Design a protein around this ligand. Structure first.
Ligand code: AMP
Ligand code: MG
Ligand code: MG
Ligand code: MG
Ligand code: MG
Ligand code: MG
Ligand code: OH
Length: 137
């Protein structure tokens, strides 16, 4: 299995939870939170943080990462199984997202909209789980 990781970044805007999604610049132009392959020497944690910095220009210092809220998605990518481990992370301040060549747009999305845009059933279930976690947090 090809291993990847990322961070489900959220913010609270005027009391409302919103999740950050990024639109790939390459077809199928799907939307996911910042995430990427585990690179040599890294574990999932390191990869999730680095990919977040690379893809959205959000640093570890700008985030409160909830270590007790993580989930791993499994799906076929490039004819092979791929795992993507995500941790939930709060963007504390009104920092500005900036993209790299890997993405062409972004959106801050309320739960239902995020699920619709992310489109994949398993990602949807993950977002619901993470939303439920914040409700009890
Ligand atoms: N949660 C998912 N379930 C199934 N397929 C996905 C999921 N996320 C991304 N993909 C697809 O897998 C391929 C690799 O996407 P990615 O893992 O985002 O680089 C793309 O063609 C996506 O459409
Ligand atoms: Mg990468
Ligand atoms: Mg990526
Ligand atoms: Mg990347
Ligand atoms: Mg890359
Ligand atoms: Mg709103
Ligand atoms: O990447």
């Amino acid at each position: 299995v090809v291993k990847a990781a990322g961070l489900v970044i959220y913010r609270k805007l005027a009391g409302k939870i919103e999740f950050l999604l990024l639109q790939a610049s390459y077809p199928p132009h799907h939307w996911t939170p910042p995430k990427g392959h585990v690179d040599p020497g890294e574990d999932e944690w390191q990869a999730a943080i680095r990919e977040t910095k690379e893809e959205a220009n959000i640093t570890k210092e700008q985030l409160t990462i909830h270590e007790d809220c993580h989930e791993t998605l499994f799906y076929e990518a490039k004819g092979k199984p791929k795992s993507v481990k995500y941790w939930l992370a709060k963007l504390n301040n009104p920092d500005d997202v900036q993209l790299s060549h890997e993405h062409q747009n972004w959106k801050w999305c309320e739960l239902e909209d995020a699920i619709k845009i992310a489109d994949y059933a398993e990602m949807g279930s993950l977002l619901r789980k993470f939303s439920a976690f914040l409700a009890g947090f």
